[PDB]
């Protein structure tokens with residue numbers, strides 16, 4: 001039985017007036033978006049930040065991901081890439097896998113095949129993900145008035161924009177920098193919520209889409225119950241922070257157990273916001289570059 005795509009999460013296309021600052025905007029859309037857990041925000045057409053990473057020196061060692069590791073119950077993350085060599089590897093993998101040019105593969109087919117492979121015992125597909133790359137190391141994808149890189153006049157607006165993830169409020173009231181993600185086809189992240197039940201905001205700088213699944217916070221405990229019922233007994237009793245490292249689950253399984261799930265394809269230039277305690281997971285459609293930070297209101 002092929003994967004059944006969840007219903008689409010809300011997409012907002014704010015006018016220039018509505019696009020003034022993310023905190024007020026998110027506060028206004030909250031009555032709807034908090035009921036879907038995730039939402040997508042498309043900035044105004046002419047809002048186009050230039051990519052500000054130091055591409056020359058950008059070197060990283062991605063983590064190895066075996067899609068079917070859970071159903072199955074010795075390759076190591078030793079390959080260093082540049083942005084360019086990782087992209088060459090990623091495009092070659094996808095075009096060879098589907099036997100067509102990377103841009104011609106329908107998003108629905110990568111989605112269907114991802115979930116098939118995750119549960120397949122007969123085919124072992126292994127991919128790589130440049131995840132947990134700190135923006136402190138090679139710079140943010142957004143221009144920043146840091147002095148490490150030069151900002152042109154046309155760039156300054158973006159260095160100062162409230163939608164530059166480096167300008168999000170990250171301190172919590174009591175008595176953090178953006179992270180970068182270099183994706184390839186089928187690279188993925190399991191179901192999780194954020195430390196402190198924080199919001200997260202996610203920007204796809206460039207590349208092929210990032211496919212998301214989200215669960216509203218009112219269903220958080222229902223998801224956690226389904227996860228405990230169906231998780232391997234050896235992982236059933238693990239603390240949430242550790243269990244979240246292996247909480248891979250087909251969205252249709254959650255949907256069959258009454259958990260509301262919403263999906264979206266995040267395209268280049270679009271934001272995805274996750275709300276407090278909104279479980280989310282996803283996978284990349286192909287070579288892409290994302291930036292994400294947690295924030296509190």
Ligand SMILES: Nc1cccc([C@@H](OCCN2CCCCC2)c2cc3nccc(C(=O)O)c3s2)c1
Nearest residue numbers: 131132179181188189190202210244245290292
């Ligand atoms: N199962 C899994 C596999 C690979 C990475 C991750 C996790 O990364 C952890 C790296 N680092 C650790 C410290 C906290 C911040 C992240 C992510 C959370 C997340 N949430 C939203 C979107 C994305 C995205 O990949 O686009 C990601 S990836 C989870």
Ligand SMILES: [Mn+2]
Nearest residue numbers: 192193194200
């Ligand atoms: Mn997250």
